[PDB]
C-alpha cells in the first residue's frame, strides 16, 4: 500500500547518497593524481591504478543499479499516486453533485410552495 511507498522513497535517497559520496570521493582521489602528474611528475603506483579502476567500475555499476530501482519503482509509485489523485477527484466530484442537488431541491420546493399558494387563493375565493 502507501506504507511500502514512503519506504522505497527513503531508500532511493539512501542509495543515491551512498553514491553522491563514492563519487565525490573519486572526484578527489583523481584530482589529487591529476595534480601529482600534471606538475609533480610523481606517477602513482601500479596499485593505486588497479585499485582506483575497480573503484570506478564499482561506481559505474552502482549507477546501473540505482537506475534499476528507479525504472522499477517509478511504475508502482506513479500508479499509486494516480489512484490517490483519483479518490480525491471523485470525493470532490461528489461534494459537487451534492452542492448542485441541494439547489435543485431549493428550486423544486419553491415551485411547490408557489403552486400550493395559488391553489389556496383558489380554494376560498
Amino acid at each position: 500500500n502507501r506504507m511500502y511507498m514512503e519506504k522505497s522513497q527513503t531508500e532511493l535517497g539512501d542509495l543515491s547518497d551512498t553514491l553522491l559520496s563514492k563519487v565525490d570521493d573519486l572526484q578527489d582521489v583523481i584530482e589529487i593524481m591529476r595534480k601529482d602528474v600534471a606538475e609533480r611528475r610523481s606517477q602513482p603506483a601500479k596499485k593505486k591504478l588497479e585499485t582506483v579502476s575497480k573503484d570506478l567500475e564499482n561506481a559505474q555499476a552502482d549507477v546501473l543499479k540505482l537506475q534499476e530501482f528507479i525504472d522499477t519503482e517509478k511504475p508502482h509509485w506513479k500508479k499509486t499516486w494516480e489512484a490517490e489523485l483519483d479518490k480525491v477527484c471523485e470525493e470532490q466530484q461528489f461534494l459537487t453533485l451534492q452542492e448542485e442537488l441541494i439547489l435543485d431541491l431549493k428550486e423544486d420546493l419553491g415551485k411547490a410552495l408557489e403552486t400550493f399558494d395559488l391553489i389556496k387563493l383558489c380554494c376560498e375565493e
Copy 2:
C-alpha cells in the same frame, strides 16, 4: 483518515436522498390538487390544506438542516484533501530531484572516467 471521509459523505448522501424523497412526495401530492382544482373545480379536503402546509415546513426545515451539514463538513473535507495533495505533491518533487541527481552523477562520474583514463595514459608512457 479515509473512514472519516467515506462515512460523512455517505451521510450527506443519505440526508438528501431523504430530503429528495420528501420533496418528490410533496410535489406529487400538490400536483393532484392542481388537477382537481383546475380541471373539475373539485376542491381538496380542507384537512390536506393543513397537512401539506406543514410538510412544506418540515421540508424547509430539512433543507436548512441539510445545508448546514454541508457547510460544517466541507471545511474538514478541504483540509483533509489538501493534506493529501500536498503529500502526493511532495513525494513527486522528491522523485523528480532523484532523477536530476542520477543525471549529475552519471555526468560528474563520466568526467572523472574521462580524466583518469587520460592519466592512466600518461603513465603508460
